[PDB]
């Protein structure tokens, strides 16, 4: 279903990384954030929801997902929350590790990893990328 994303939080090099996975496509968005707060989650969601159609998000029960500040952003943006694909998170960490030396800070490395994850092809020269799958899924939901 085209409007469903899983959102989830993870750590590397002592920093925090917010990761949102589009479940039908495997398309990812992620960013290093300064602390594991609901405020940072809220801002991150607004950005995501302004770029793609976000209808429902799945998360866990961490306080950085159940706060008012997050619930206010969801109400504003028209996003339904569900509480309760660890696969795309492992793929991302592998990617990050591999490009890590091509960038000075982790924050840049993470965006290089996201670029790669979304552009990469499985199944050869003819295979599809997460980035191509998501715009296809969304394009055929309008029509």
């Amino acid at each position: 279903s085209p409007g469903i994303w899983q959102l989830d939080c993870t750590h590397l090099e002592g920093k925090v990384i917010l990761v949102a996975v589009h479940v039908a496509s495997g398309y990812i968005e992620a960013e290093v954030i300064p602390a594991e707060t609901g405020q940072e989650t809220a801002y991150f969601l607004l950005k995501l929801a302004g770029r793609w159609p976000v209808k429902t998000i799945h998360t866990d029960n961490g306080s950085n997902f159940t706060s008012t500040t997050v619930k206010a952003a969801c109400d504003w943006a028209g996003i339904k929350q569900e509480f309760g694909v660890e696969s795309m998170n492992k793929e991302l960490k592998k990617i990050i590790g591999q490009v890590r030396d091509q960038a000075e800070h982790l924050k840049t490395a993470v965006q290089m990893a996201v670029f790669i994850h979304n552009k990469k092809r499985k199944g050869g020269i003819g295979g599809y990328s997460a980035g191509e799958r998501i715009v296809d899924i969304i394009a055929t939901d309008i029509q």
Epitope: I95, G97, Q98, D101, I116, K119, K120, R121, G123, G126
Partner: antibody
Framework: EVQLVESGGGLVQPGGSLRLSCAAS????????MHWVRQAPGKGLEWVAY????????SYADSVKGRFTISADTSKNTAYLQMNSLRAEDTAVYYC???????????????????????WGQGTLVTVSS | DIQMTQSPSSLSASVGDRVTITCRAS??????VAWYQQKPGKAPKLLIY???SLYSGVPSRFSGSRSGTDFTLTISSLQPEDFATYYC?????????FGQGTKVEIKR
Amino acid sequence: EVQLVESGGGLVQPGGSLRLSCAASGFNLYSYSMHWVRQAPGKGLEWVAYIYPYSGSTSYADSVKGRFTISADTSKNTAYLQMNSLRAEDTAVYYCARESSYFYDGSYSYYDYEGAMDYWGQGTLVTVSS
Amino acid sequence: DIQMTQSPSSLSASVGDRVTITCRASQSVSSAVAWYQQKPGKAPKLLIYSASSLYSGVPSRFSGSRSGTDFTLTISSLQPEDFATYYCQQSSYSPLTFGQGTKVEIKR
């Protein structure tokens, strides 16, 4: 130029122990998932364990759980397989291999390796016998 | 604990032949299948990854394909250096597992 050179294999008695090393060069082993895969004499290939030092995760085949410990020393660009409580059936050639995440084609495209192992060492023989 | 059933075990061929080796996964493993070649006393060398991508430097006569849970490695025109043993692998589920092998030997 990438390579892997394993060592530490030899003859050892049942119940004995050994430690294999895999020294890497041409690349930073911290950044990649490294596997041990073994081959009993005249048999096929059996996955043994892996480690991805960057993230700290590790993993083991059921037939080695409790007996084997994979690890890495980044200062030496080397991975290790500590093998305790050895039985006759652990006799095998042991290979270390690198798993890359992706391959970059050198003009703007990327391909996922999906767990494939791009470079392997020549292997070291471990014989377990009375 | 996923099984990769590789066939045939052994195969006789001649230089110039089309050769095709198969691997059946005991349940969907998606596209996460690789193929390796191994010669006597040597390490396995990677041929194909992610079902059908050709590893850098491997001759174009090697190719891979998928249908469902059935994977195929095909050598379009067998060369004298291709007589060897071949192995499939899946890395969709831990533990990752290998087929039992296919020896390609010379007809006469």
